[PDB]
Amino acid sequence: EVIIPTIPKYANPYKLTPGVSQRLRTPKALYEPWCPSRLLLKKRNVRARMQFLLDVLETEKEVEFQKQRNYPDFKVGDVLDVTMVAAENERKTYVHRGLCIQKRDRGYGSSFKLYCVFSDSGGFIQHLPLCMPDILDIKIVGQVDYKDEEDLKELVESESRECKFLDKVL
Amino acid sequence: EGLEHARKDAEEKGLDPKKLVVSTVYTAKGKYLRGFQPMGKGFAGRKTTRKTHLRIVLRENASVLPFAAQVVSPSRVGGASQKHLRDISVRYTV
Amino acid sequence: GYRPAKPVYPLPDSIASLVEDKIAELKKFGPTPEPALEPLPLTPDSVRVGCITVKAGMTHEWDEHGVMIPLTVLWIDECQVVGLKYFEKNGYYAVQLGAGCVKQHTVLPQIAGYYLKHDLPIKREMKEYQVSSPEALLPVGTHITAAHFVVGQQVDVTGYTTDKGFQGVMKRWGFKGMPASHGVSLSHRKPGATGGRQDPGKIWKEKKLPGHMGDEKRTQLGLELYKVDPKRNLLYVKGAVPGPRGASILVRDSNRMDYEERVALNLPYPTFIGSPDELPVLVRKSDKDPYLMYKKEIDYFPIKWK
Amino acid sequence: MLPNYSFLKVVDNSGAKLVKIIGFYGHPGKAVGVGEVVKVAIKEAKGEKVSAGEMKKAVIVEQKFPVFRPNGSHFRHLRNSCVLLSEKGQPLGNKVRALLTYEFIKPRWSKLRTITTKKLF
Amino acid sequence: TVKRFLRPGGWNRLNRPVKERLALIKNMATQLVEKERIRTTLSKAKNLQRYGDKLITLGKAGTRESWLKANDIVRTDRELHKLFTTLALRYKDRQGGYVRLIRAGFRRGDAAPVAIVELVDREGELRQARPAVTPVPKFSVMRWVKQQLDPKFISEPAPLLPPLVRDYLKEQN
RNA sequence: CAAUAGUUUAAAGAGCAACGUUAAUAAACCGGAAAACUUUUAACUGCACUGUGCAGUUGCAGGCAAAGCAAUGUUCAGCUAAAAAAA
Ligand SMILES: [K+]
Ligand SMILES: [K+]
Ligand SMILES: [K+]
Ligand SMILES: [Mg+2]
Ligand SMILES: [Mg+2]
Ligand SMILES: [Mg+2]
Ligand SMILES: [Mg+2]
Ligand SMILES: [Mg+2]
Ligand SMILES: [Mg+2]
What we know:
Chain A: bL19m
Radius of gyration of chain D: 14 Å
PDB class: ribosome
Entry title: Structure of the mitochondrial ribosome from Polytomella magna with tRNAs bound to the A and P sites
Organism of A: Polytomella magna
Oligomer: part of a larger assembly
Keywords: mitoribosome, ribosome, mitochondria, polytomella, fragmentation, rrna, evolution, translation
Bound molecules: potassium ion, magnesium ion
């Protein structure tokens, strides 16, 4: 006439860290953000756990991307050669050469800007997500010196000595 | 101040302070200090300081309201505070 | 609020006994039904139950065609059936679902009493879904998980929006305002006229004016379910969802879908029976070309040549 | 994103140098971008094919405002330019000094895709 | 806890412009070091508590860079000398929480709330603060957990000169 | 509000915004009163609280760390300190 409820088991015996995906230098967490509130040793706010859940998902996608691609650690002021696929033109491959004028390090949303000048048409700027699958390879080919952001902006407005390659290859 | 003064009056008359109830309270007009303050474009206004009288009457076993307030102790400061002796080793167990 | 209570009178001794006998007879109920969990056929007019979820935030991903897709993440912590309604006692059939978890000493005794009586955890939110027939009722305690949905279907989301505070007409209703120069005097952001003259002589109800903005119930229809993660009770939905982080969101099969579409999806009915732990992560497949306009003329072009 | 009554530079060899937008076609909204056809008035021309004061049709080829692609990227130019067109839909010149973008891969712009010097695709 | 605002740094505005705001907070921070106990309004006390904690952190650093930052905050040479010498050694093992705040009701004239701000380890302290390093029972779950997660847990105060420095000096001499 | 553009130096992967993103062409959508039903010893402040509390005592947007900086880790601060002995 007595019904005993079921007690859940522990996943990792005598291990105090669940082993969630995090960056190498970050101290390890002690819980899984997707665990139900009822089964937690510490009852932390749902709102704070949801922020941590998104961070875990972002790191999982970044790990998969790094296994697929290996790009160099370029900086602002370097000349780059970028291989891209044009989905509009039946997914054809082209190689672009230009100067890197802005770089944002924001995890999976990282991006950079490429600048180039043509013989007659003038300047041309592109904004490229770094983790976009359309990009196939990136290489460093040179460097252009500048003093500060103001000097770099003046160079961009006054198109000059940025005509590395006149046209796109392939 | 009025409440304390009235209770002292009741004790002199031989009433029990533990059964006193505030049965009547009202105000009365005093003598006013008149004044004037200038305004724009040559107009003028009033500047009055008011005064009032206060009367309190305390009676025994009069009809009273049931309101009662909860009381708590203030912050413990000094040798009477022992929050530093808490043992925090228990919260690491299941 | 409510109106003042109406007066009551004792019944005459020649009628009191009769009234009590009849009232008691009407208030006598039979045994509670015992639902059974078993797959059922889907009919042209048959509605399923929804679920209660928590909004987590937004992210993005690239699909098989290389297109960037904005996503909103919804988490299902614990959703269970906590009560039933049936015709004999209430006049209609419905299923009550609860979600969340709270501590006993943080809620009123009235709320905690219902859950303790049936050996269920005290849940933070409760919502009712109406069913079509008694056979659609689910046994109390059944779990509603992420497996309840089929990847690639359309869903509806409801919730309370973000609070904005006291806002003016320009931000609240999009009024144009008045010029910044040319003699304007202290009326740059004001609503202007609010009526006429002696006729009609009043201001109409629901005339748009300043006030509080941002905490109201809204529903978005026809969102696409992109990815499903049954093991971790996660749903990825394309588009925007009302409310800030942590808001409670109700998810339902969209009413924009026809019966044929529901048959093709083969939606679980009354719900998924099994263990969702041993299920993989699935992503919907779109048999469409987002770059077709570059090979064929399908775009909008108003000019006809010659 | 060019509002009405904007000035454009001509990048063809028909003789026109400066034009002003004076109308739109269809329902494009409050602004127009690359790939749309507008009605323009010639303000400065040095040639016999066209003269100042005439009204012609033109197509937007370059703009300074971001142009977004489905993959999340975008690009920008440093000028706003156009190419004059005839009533039959053909260019009034035979040489275009501009960088052609993906908008003109469509079948209806075959003639432009032939006379243009540099192409991004 | 101290509320966080939307301005740069999340500080209070103290009903002042930024220039006057920084001049006021620097002066009060100097007086807190000199006297170790001050009574003021609630808003100035909340801002001073968070600012005071970050000033002690600079003193504990004991570096040329840290001293330069502090030299622009403290107004008196005597107060700056005390910060790096006396207070630096006092809070070697305490990890944060060097200042406490206790509310003390309302004033008389304008009925503004008030509070008392004080340092948390000294003679004359309002209360007795918990030890900087928490002792760990020898047969507790807490001891086992710390071993598995942080093998470098500190259980007792450490000497001014660690054994490695002492050994080096002995070998040298 | 993931990304893109603008905006704040006690700064920033903050917040708010559109020039940005998603959805709608319906017996759909939204508001207040209320029958009935259910629960209760018939309920009733508060986290600096003139943003939000979907946070009430291993609770927390404070402090502190090698950390993505309203997240992870944490021995300190404040509100609110705990235990029969033995078998
Ligand atoms: K009306
Ligand atoms: K959303
Ligand atoms: K600091
Ligand atoms: Mg005068
Ligand atoms: Mg205006
Ligand atoms: Mg005037
Ligand atoms: Mg004005
Ligand atoms: Mg926001
Ligand atoms: Mg902090």
